[PDB]
């Protein structure tokens, strides 16, 4: 297979390069405009404030940037991200390998503990997921059988019914773990339908950018909400595990 | 299994709750540090520049925050969506690492990202299994020759196998964990602790994004910048085995 792997490797590289071109094309113009806007803000501030040098305003912006980067809020001047609810949720983002990162560890102790927490945590959760997966399969297939049998009752072929059940399985999951949550989050997080789908998928793929995080919003008095989502994650991931393995098979069939 | 899964579930929940307690204990004390630093910077600036009202400095910080939010960079290149950085970003997707140190701003960008990942992750998954086996068999070929030396000192061969496999996951570790931590220490101006934290957060595919090499060709060693994706690919393979061996151990007990 060594020839095939070189072919596969180059295929992935081409895929990344094509991804890179598309992402640049779509994202770079806005990033260049943001840069121009920072520059416009500096030039207006110098014109307004003659006792400030270009270079002193430069340090202010760098120092401000570092503080915002540490999670400082521009809106306030006062003085919990690590309340038991959010801290539980943060631990959840580790073992799931989602790793939103919308709140960072500041302590060397925090980081050192995180290493061993993850090294023990991820494989542990991996085992549970396989378990929940097997359980999920049994549950749905036994359930799908009854409606599967109604198709069999109207005399349709058994080999046809397996694939109908397979397709039906995919539909059931999507409604329960893709569309419902997107609709849920749309209402709860005041996101757009597309923002919500983006979040849902980025979450269940375990990519976890952290640009979008359900519950994170400081204002919301719904701490019970955030872990409840973590149960959706638990159930969602097994569903998406199946989807991700199966789409690989589709690519295997194409190759 | 019924007992097993509910037992395992409760175990995981307890683990999460105990994790929560430990994190809150360590991290809640320092929550407001970045707010304190911003405030320090503001007040120090008002003292230095009497032509500036607290309210005018206020808008500057909001306007700067929005610019940075849009991907503007404090400048004193630097493009996160130049072909090099955009390649690396696409890499963060299919690997499921997802640093997010650079966010998508366009709804079109997000829409494409969905399909790019949904097709891209399994494709990489396939290649990873492939690259895992190819290296695995090649390493195993190497393992046999090491096993021979142990065999010729009359170590029982089952002991030799485990000894070799342990050496297996140790040479891999030195090759992919220690070298980078040293590399990053020098290259990124990180502490050896920050570097191992980065390496492991990376190879576990957690990808917080608090620490990122960046694969950004800057100068001095520009070749190495995208080259670390090579370490990631190779490293991920080694760490896959590490994760499974830790996982299998938990199953064993």
């Amino acid at each position: 297979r060594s020839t095939t792997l070189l072919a596969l490797l180059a295929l992935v590289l081409l895929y990344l390069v094509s991804g890179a071109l598309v992402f640049r094309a779509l994202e770079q113009p806005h990033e260049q405009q943001a840069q121009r806007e920072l520059g416009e803000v500096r030039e207006k501030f110098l014109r307004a404030h003659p006792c400030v040098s270009d270079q002193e305003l430069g340090l202010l912006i760098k120092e401000v940037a570092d503080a915002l980067g540490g999670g400082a809020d521009p809106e306030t001047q006062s003085t919990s991200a690590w309340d038991l609810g959010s801290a539980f949720f943060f631990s959840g983002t580790i073992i799931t390998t989602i790793g939103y990162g919308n709140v960072a560890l500041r302590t060397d102790a925090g980081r050192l503990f995180c290493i061993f927490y993850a090294l023990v945590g991820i494989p542990l959760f991996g085992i549970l997921l396989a378990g929940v997966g097997d359980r999920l399969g049994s549950s749905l297939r036994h359930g799908i059988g009854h409606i599967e049998a109604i198709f069999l009752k109207w005399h349709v072929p058994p080999e046809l019914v397996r694939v109908l059940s397979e397709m039906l399985f995919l539909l059931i999951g999507c409604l329960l773990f893709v569309l419902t949550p997107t609709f849920v989050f749309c209402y709860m997080e005041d996101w757009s339908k597309l923002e919500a789908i983006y979040f849902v998928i980025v979450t269940l793929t375990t990519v976890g950018f952290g640009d979008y995080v359900a519950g994170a919003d400081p204002r919301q008095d719904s701490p019970a909400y955030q872990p409840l989502v973590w149960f959706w994650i638990l159930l969602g991931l097994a569903y998406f595990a199946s989807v991700l393995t199966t789409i690989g098979n589709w690519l295997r069939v194409v190759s | 299994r019924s007992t097993t899964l509910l037992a395992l579930l409760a175990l995981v929940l307890l683990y999460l709750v105990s994790g929560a307690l430990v994190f809150r204990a360590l991290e809640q004390p320092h929550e407001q540090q970045a707010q304190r630093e911003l405030g320090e910077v503001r007040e120090k600036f008002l003292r230095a520049h009497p032509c500036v009202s607290d309210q005018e400095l206020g808008l500057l910080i909001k306007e700067v925050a929005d610019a940075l939010g849009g991907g503007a960079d404090p400048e004193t290149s630097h493009s996160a969506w130049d072909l090099g950085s955009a390649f690396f970003f696409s890499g963060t997707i299919i690997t499921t690492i997802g640093y997010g140190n650079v966010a998508l701003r366009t709804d079109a960008g997000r829409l494409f990202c969905i399909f790019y990942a949904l097709v891209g992750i399994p494709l990489f998954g396939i290649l990873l299994a492939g690259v895992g086996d190819r290296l695995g068999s090649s390493l195993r070929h190497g393992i046999g020759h090491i096993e021979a030396i142990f065999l010729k000192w009359h170590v029982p061969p089952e002991l030799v196998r485990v000894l070799s496999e342990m050496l297996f996951l140790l040479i891999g570790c030195l090759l992919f964990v220690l070298t980078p931590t040293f590399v990053f220490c020098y290259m990124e101006d990180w502490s050896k602790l920050e570097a191992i934290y980065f390496v492991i957060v990376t190879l576990t595919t957690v990808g917080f994004g608090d620490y990122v090499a960046g694969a950004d060709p800057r100068q001095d060693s520009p070749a190495y910048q995208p080259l670390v994706w090579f370490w990631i690919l190779l490293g991920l393979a080694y760490f896959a085995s590490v994760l499974t061996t830790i996982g299998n151990w938990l199953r064993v007990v």
Epitope: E43, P50, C51, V52, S53, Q55 | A48, H49
Partner: antibody, heavy 116, light 107 residues
């Protein structure tokens, strides 16, 4: 009337250093950034560096990093430029000028001659 | 390290001629400023922020431009306009100047 009054022409030996001054009047010295500019007949007008007279903050053109030291006396509202280990390449007219984006007021200039 | 190019370096105008001198920037710049210098005297702020006239500057002077191309214009050349005109930029530190454009009277 905003005014920048520079000290007179200076003649110094190769290798010597030199210090020139600019007293401001008609405005608050500490309110505005102060700059020095070099005019040689052959070359472009060249920005040397700036000082914030209120904070003492300084930055230099990379081309003059080692050469030039800017300082101020807040009490006498006077800006100073020092030039070190002088060569004939430093023979020029030097101006102090005010501004943080545009140089809105200039001194009359001082002529430096480096010569044995 | 932004470079400003004034060409030609010297130019001549009969009284009543419309004159335009241009300043090319090696990369994009948000605002261009201009100084007038007559032999024996320091540069004077002439135009700032591309098209703003400094206090004493007579109305026959205009400035214009954007991006990497900027211009100073005299609607009708006068005797007292014979001088050297410099562009300068400060959209990027360090601020930089054109080599200047010397405008002589034609006779």
């Amino acid at each position: 009337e905003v005014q920048l009054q520079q000290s007179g022409p200076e003649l110094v030996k190769p290798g010597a250093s030199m210090k020139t001054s600019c007293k401001v009047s008609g405005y608050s010295f500490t309110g505005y950034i102060m700059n020095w500019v070099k005019q040689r007949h052959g070359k472009n007008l060249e920005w040397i560096g700036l000082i914030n007279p209120n904070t003492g903050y300084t930055t230099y053109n990379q081309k003059f990093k080692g050469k030039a030291t800017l300082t101020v006396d807040k009490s006498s509202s006077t800006a100073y430029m020092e030039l070190l280990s002088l060569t004939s390449e430093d023979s020029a007219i030097y101006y102090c000028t005010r501004g943080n984006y545009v140089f809105d007021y200039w001194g009359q200039g001082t002529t430096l001659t480096v010569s044995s | 390290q932004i470079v400003l190019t004034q060409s030609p370096a010297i130019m001549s105008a009969s009284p009543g001629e419309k004159v335009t001198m241009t300043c090319s920037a090696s990369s994009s710049v948000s605002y261009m400023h201009w100084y007038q210098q007559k032999s024996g005297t320091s540069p004077k702020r002439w135009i700032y922020d591309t098209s703003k006239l400094a206090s004493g500057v007579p109305a026959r002077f205009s400035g214009s431009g954007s991006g990497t191309s900027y211009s100073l214009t005299i609607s009708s050349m006068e005797a007292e306009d014979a001088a050297t005109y410099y562009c300068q930029q400060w959209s990027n530190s360090p601020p930089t100047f054109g080599a200047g454009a010397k405008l002589e009277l034609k006779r």
